[PDB]
Amino acid sequence: DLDLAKASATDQLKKAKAEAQVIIEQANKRRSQILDEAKAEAEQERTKIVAQ
């Protein structure tokens, strides 16, 4: 046990640390997706309204 308790302590730390970064990075991918979409379609709207 004095060794399986050590091994599991590093095993959880490794997995948890990677997932926490992956979550927050893809939150930045979603943010930049949302911003990119809005920043594009603002002109797609205006270019329709002047043609109208």
Next chain:
Amino acid sequence: MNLNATILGQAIAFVLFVLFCMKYVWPPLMAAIEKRQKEIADGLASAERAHK
């Protein structure tokens, strides 16, 4: 029976076997036993710490 000078002679032999037993025999044996008993307690503690 008959009381005798043997009563004093045996009293010299008795004290001197108690003094060499007290210094030499008993402290090195009981240090060696307690040194084993202590380690068993150390193993139990380690099992508790591992789980926690």
